[PDB]
C-alpha cells in the first residue's frame, strides 16, 4: 500500500494561480483539498486515521501554512530569475510513503515541472533529477538555503508520513480488504480480416484490484487473450476487459474464466 499526497498547481501569470490536492491510500481516495476550500475534506469515514482531533488540526494547520508559503515561494523563485518563459507554470508534487509489512516504510517527496520529473528530497536537501532543465539548479540552491523548511520536510518524511499513514492503514484495513464480486458479460466485434472475430470479455465491479481473466477452450488457456487496462468505476471498484481474436466458427466452446478473491474458488465460467 502506497500513501500519497498529490498536489496539482497551475501558475497562469504573476498573480493568478490554483492548487488542488488529494490524498490516496493504495487505490482509495482518503482526502480532498480544492483551491477555494480553506480546510481539507475527508472522503472516507476512517480518513482521520488514529489521530485525535487536536493531532488532525495541527496536521491540517501545517498544510494551510504550507499552501500559502508554496504559492508565495514559486512566485518569488520565478520573479527573482526570469527564465525567458516566466508563465504558464505547471507543478505536480507527490509526497508520502510506501507501506511494507512489519511497521517498515520508505518516504518520498517528488516534483514534476511542466509534466516532467524534476526534483526529489533526500536526506536534508532538494536534488534536481536526471532530465530536468539545468537552470532549475539556481531555485534549488535558493530553496536549500532555508534549513527551517528543510527540517519540516525531514519531519514530514521521517515522522508525519510513516506515523499518520500506519494509523490510516489500520483504520482503513477493513475497507482495503472488502470483497466486491465481479460481474462478467460477453460481446464480439468483427475484426479487420474476413472470417475473423474479436471476442470481448467484460469484467466489472470487483474489489480488490488483483484479478485473473482468461479466454479458455476447456482446460486450455487461450494464449491470444489480451488483457486491457484496469479502468475505475465511480464506486472505486474496477473494470477490465480481455479480448481474443478468433477465426469465424471457432467461438463455439470458448468461455471466459474469471478468478477473483471474492468468489472463493468458484470461478466465473461464461461460455460464448
Amino acid at each position: 500500500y502506497t500513501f500519497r499526497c498529490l498536489q496539482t498547481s497551475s501558475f497562469a501569470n504573476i498573480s493568478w494561480s490554483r492548487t488542488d490536492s488529494l490524498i490516496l491510500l493504495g487505490d482509495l481516495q482518503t482526502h480532498r483539498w480544492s483551491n477555494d476550500s480553506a480546510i481539507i475534506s475527508f472522503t472516507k469515514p476512517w480518513s482521520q486515521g488514529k489521530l485525535s482531533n487536536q493531532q488532525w488540526e495541527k496536521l491540517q494547520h501545517m498544510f494551510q501554512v504550507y499552501r500559502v508559503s508554496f504559492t508565495r515561494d514559486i512566485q518569488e523563485l520565478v520573479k527573482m530569475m526570469s527564465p525567458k518563459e516566466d508563465y504558464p507554470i505547471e507543478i505536480q508534487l507527490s509526497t508520502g510513503c510506501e507501506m511494507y509489512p512489519g511497521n517498515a516504510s520508505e518516504s518520498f517527496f517528488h516534483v514534476a515541472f511542466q509534466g516532467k520529473y524534476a526534483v526529489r528530497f533526500r536526506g536534508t536537501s532538494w536534488q534536481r533529477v536526471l532530465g530536468a532543465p539545468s537552470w532549475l539548479d539556481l531555485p534549488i540552491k535558493v530553496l536549500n538555503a532555508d534549513q527551517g523548511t528543510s527540517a519540516t520536510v525531514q519531519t514530514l518524511l521521517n515522522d508525519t508520513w510513516p506515523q499518520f499513514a500506519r494509523g490510516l492503514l489500520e483504520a482503513g484495513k477493513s475497507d482495503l480488504e472488502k470483497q466486491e464480486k465481479p460481474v462478467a458479460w460477453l460481446s464480439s466485434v468483427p475484426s479487420s480480416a474476413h472470417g475473423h472475430l474479436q471476442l470481448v470479455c467484460h469484467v466489472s465491479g470487483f474489489y480488490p484490484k488483483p484479478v485473473w481473466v482468461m479466454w479458455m477452450r476447456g482446460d486450455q488457456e487461450q494464449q491470444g487473450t489480451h488483457r486491457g487496462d484496469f479502468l475505475p468505476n465511480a464506486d472505486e471498484t474496477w473494470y477490465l476487459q480481455a479480448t481474443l481474436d478468433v477465426e469465424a466458427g471457432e467461438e463455439a466452446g470458448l468461455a471466459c474464466r474469471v478468478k477473483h478473491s471474492s468468489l472463493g474458488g468458484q470461478d466465473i465460467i461464461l461460455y460464448w
Binding site: 480532498r32 514534476a112 479502468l231 468505476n233 465511480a234
Partner: protein
Amino acid sequence: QKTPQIQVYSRHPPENGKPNILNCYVTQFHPPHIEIQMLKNGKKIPKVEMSDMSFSKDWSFYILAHTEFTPTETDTYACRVKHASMAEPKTVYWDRDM
C-alpha cells in the same frame, strides 16, 4: 503537451431500458486543463459527475467522468474531450460490443 486517451464503458452489463452508469475515463494528457462532456444523441448530458484531478506514478493525469443513463436501441452516447494538444475536440462513442 500530451494527447488525451478516452475510454467509454458501462458499470453494469448493458440491457435496453435498464438504468445504468456510463463511464468516460480520460488519461495521459498534459497540461491538466481539460473540458469533458458526455453526450446523448449529440446533445450535452446535464448531470455529469467528475472525479478530482489526479495523476499516476509516471505523472500522467487521469480523470473519470460518469453519468446515469438508460441504454436504448436508437440512442447514441459519447464522450467529447477538448484539450490544447489537439486541433479538434475528440469524440469517442459508446459501443457496448467493443
